[PDB]
Amino acid sequence: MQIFVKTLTGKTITLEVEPSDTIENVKAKIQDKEGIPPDQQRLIFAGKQLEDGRTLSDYNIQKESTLHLVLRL
Amino acid sequence: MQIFVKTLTGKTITLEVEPSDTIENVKAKIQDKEGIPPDQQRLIFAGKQLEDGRTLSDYNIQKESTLHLVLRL
């Protein structure tokens, strides 16, 4: 499925992910797309931070969902 | 009507409110339900942050609406 991740600066990145893919898979996709390390990225879905062990289906992430990416130092 | 509030931990809180009820009443209900003070709570729904001087009908909040709660430190 196609998903969109928005950062705090307004930049939106489109990725191809599956519902069974974990949040770590989304972090790896974002690292491939932009170069941000997975440990420096925080993913939020529906106002709640997504866990790396949990998947997109566990977080009820559907097609064309809007995830939130937060940078960390 | 019944409304849903999503927290950062994934817990969903169901609240009984009316369209004429202000966001201050919703903050008081959230304080009665979870103990979070109204000064440290921010409500986000339909692309706009909830204002204390506005009502649910002004924000076009209908039955079974899903808003998000953000806790300030």
């Binding site: 928005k6 950062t7 529906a46 106002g47 939130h68 940078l71 | 986000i44 706009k48 942050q49």
Partner: peptide, 29 residues
């Protein structure tokens, strides 16, 4: 929206980072 919440959570995240920098500048000097 989720973008609004992202910007807000980044706002308190940067505020926590700046308080950490305050503590740093406290005891390095």
């Amino acid at each position: 929206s989720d973008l609004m919440l992202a910007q807000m959570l980044q706002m308190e995240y940067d505020r926590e980072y700046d308080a950490q920098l305050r503590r740093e500048e406290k005891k390095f000097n």
